[PDB]
Structures are given as structure tokens and as C-alpha cells.
């Protein structure tokens, strides 16, 4: 699977039928149709920079992975009673500045999107166990709006020169990804899925109301990453965003 016309989102359903499920992500958030929910607690993140482990080129994207052997780095509050353990962050982007976000807000497409992914360590003993369970994953989505260079991205962008081609990986240490989040943690939440195969309907989405910035040149760095292995013909990673999917009558709740 990939993002090409042949192996891309519109074809995913052939091998992964859950693509046509009732809890697929991402979605268009219609602000007129959101339900303000008084029970929602503030989102609480507490990440230890010592849990940062590795940056990896996975061909369709790059990931920054965290040591997840204990509760040093955790998400709490919002719609959750359980504590969720940080394991990864990554981005999505588009071929142009005009699209690239996965979530949209009232039809508006942002240039990119940050995903900070966590697993339910109260109920489950590993990411592998948690990953397929309705209450297994919690992902914070931050919409990224093209404008001023974002200095908080600096360590991440500087690391890409070491993982230019598929499969390449490097230590990525001493980094707290709560530095990338907007200063307001007002959010939307809805029950949904991983936005690429295997598309498990295991994610509680936390979508920040406030966007963070990214420059056109910072976006060019993401797209200058190569999907091919070293020595092969260069194939830029131009985009990796899934189209919005039907709500099929789910409710997006607002903390605000």
C-alpha cells in the first residue's frame, strides 16, 4: 500500500475492507454540527525528553519513536479516564501548500498535520495489544498552516539529512514533542481510526482548535525526503494525506 493512484487511499479497501467502515479517519469537522460537552477535562501532556529514541524513514513518511517501557511520557484528561503512553510522532503533508492536512475544519485544508500517538497502558500491556482495541490508541492532531518558519520543528528538520532514503534510521534523543503543540489545547474529539493501513478503528482523536505554523521551505524539506532505498532512482515523498471519510453519524465533541 502507498499514496500512488495504484496502491493509494481509493484502492486500500481491496486488501483492508475496514477502509469503508463506520469509524474511519480523517474527517471534515463541521463546527455548526459539533456538540459542546461539559464532562471533557483539559488535555494534560507530560513527556520526558529522555524517552525520545529514533527517527526512521518508513518510505511513505518518517517517524520519531519513543521508548514506551513505562509511564515517563503520558497523555491524560480530555475524554479519557486511563493514562495513555507516548510512542511516536509523525507528520502528513500534500504535493502543494493548498492541501496536506488529513483533518479539515469546515472544508478548509491545511498544509500539513502533526500526529502525536499514544497507547492505553492502563488497560493493555503493549502497543501491539492496544493497537486493534476500540479504546487502545489516543492521537493528538495539530493542523499546520503555511506561514512563518516554525523554530520548534528545527531539531526534526535538521535530522532528515541522516534518513534521506527508505529504511535509514538514526538516534533521535532528548526531545519533548509537547514543544510542538499549540499554546491553547482546546480540542475536538471523535472515535475513529488509523489514517493508513491497517486502518484499525482504535483511535480516540484529539484535534487542536489552534493551528501551528510551518514555512513553504520547511514543507519542501518533508517533500525532499526519498521513498526509494539508497542507490535507486530518487522518488520524492511528495504527499501522504488521506482524504476525509464519512462521519456515518458519529458526533464530534468540543471542549470549548
Shortest gap between Cβ of 96 and ligand V2I (angstroms)?
20
226 binds ligand V2I (CB under 6 A): no
Query: Is residue 115 a contact residue for ligand V2I (CB under 6 A)?
Result: yes
Cα–Cα distances (Å) from 202 to 40, 110, 132, 136, in that order, read 19, 24, 6, 5
Residue 131 touches ligand V2I, criterion: CB under 6 A: yes
Contacts of 217 (CB under 8 A, 6+ apart): 149
The reply on whether position 237 binds ligand V2I by CB under 6 A is no
Task: Pick one of ligand V2I, Zn ion, none as the site partner of residue 103 (Cβ within 5 to 8 A by kind).
Answer: none
Q: Is 118 annotated as a binding residue?
A: no
Q: Smallest distance from the beta carbon of 127 to ligand V2I, in angstroms?
A: 6
Helix or strand holding residue 95 (H, E): none
Q: Is 118 in the site for ligand V2I (CB under 6 A)?
A: no
DSSP, collapsed to helix, strand or coil, labels residue 74 as: strand
**What is the per-residue burial (b if ≥16 Cβ within 10 Å, else e) of 49-83?**
eebbbbbbbebbbbbbbbbbeeebbbbbbbbbebb
Three cell numbers, residue 95: 504535493
Distance in Å, CB of 254 to ligand V2I, minimum: 21
Chain residues that interact with Zn ion, rule: CB under 5 A = 115
Question: Smallest gap, in angstroms, from Cβ of residue 236 to ligand V2I?
Answer: 20
Site for ligand V2I in 160-219 (CB under 6 A): 194-196, 198, 203
Task: Using alpha carbons, select from 167, 207, 176 the residue that is nearest to residue 190.
Answer: 207
**What are the catalytic residues?**
60
Q: Is residue 212 classed as helix, strand or coil in its secondary structure?
A: strand
224 membership: H or E segment, kind and range = helix 216-224
What residues pair up with 36 in beta bridges, in sequence order?
A: 254
117 is an interface residue for ligand V2I by CB under 6 A: yes
CB nearer to ligand V2I: pick between 64 and 139: 139
Residues at the contact surface with ligand V2I, assessed by CB under 6 A: 115, 117, 131, 137, 139, 194-196, 198, 203
The annotated binding site is made up of 60, 63, 90, 92, 115, 195-196
Amino acid at each position: 500500500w502507498g499514496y500512488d493512484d495504484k496502491n493509494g487511499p481509493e484502492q486500500w479497501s481491496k486488501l483492508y475492507p475496514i477502509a469503508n467502515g463506520n469509524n474511519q479517519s480523517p474527517v471534515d469537522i463541521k463546527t455548526s454540527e459539533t456538540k459542546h460537552d461539559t464532562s471533557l477535562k483539559p488535555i494534560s501532556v507530560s513527556y520526558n525528553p529522555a524517552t525520545a529514541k529514533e527517527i526512521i524513514n518508513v518510505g511513505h513518511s518518517f517517524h520519531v519513536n519513543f521508548e514506551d517501557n513505562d509511564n515517563r511520557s503520558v497523555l491524560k484528561g480530555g475524554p479519557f479516564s486511563d493514562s495513555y503512553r507516548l510512542f511516536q510522532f509523525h507528520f502528513h503533508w500534500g504535493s502543494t501548500n493548498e492541501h496536506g492536512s488529513e483533518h479539515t475544519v469546515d472544508g478548509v485544508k491545511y498544509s500539513a498535520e502533526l500526529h502525536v500517538a499514544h497507547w492505553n497502558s492502563a488497560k493493555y500491556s503493549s502497543l501491539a495489544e492496544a493497537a486493534s482495541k476500540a479504546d487502545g490508541l489516543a492521537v493528538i492532531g495539530v493542523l499546520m498552516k503555511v506561514g512563518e518558519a516554525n523554530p520548534k520543528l528545527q531539531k526534526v528538520l535538521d535530522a532528515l539529512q541522516a534518513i534521506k532514503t527508505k529504511g535509514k534510521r538514526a538516534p533521535f534523543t532528548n526531545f519533548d514533542p509537547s514543544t510542538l503543540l499549540p499554546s491553547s489545547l482546546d480540542f475536538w474529539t471523535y472515535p475513529g481510526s488509523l489514517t493508513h493501513p491497517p486502518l484499525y478503528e482504535s483511535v480516540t482523536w484529539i484535534i487542536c482548535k489552534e493551528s501551528i505554523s510551518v514555512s513553504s521551505e520547511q514543507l519542501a524539506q518533508f517533500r525532499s525526503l526519498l521513498s526509494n532505498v539508497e542507490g535507486d532512482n530518487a522518488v520524492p515523498m511528495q504527499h501522504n494525506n488521506r482524504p476525509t471519510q464519512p462521519l456515518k453519524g458519529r458526533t464530534v465533541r468540543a471542549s470549548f
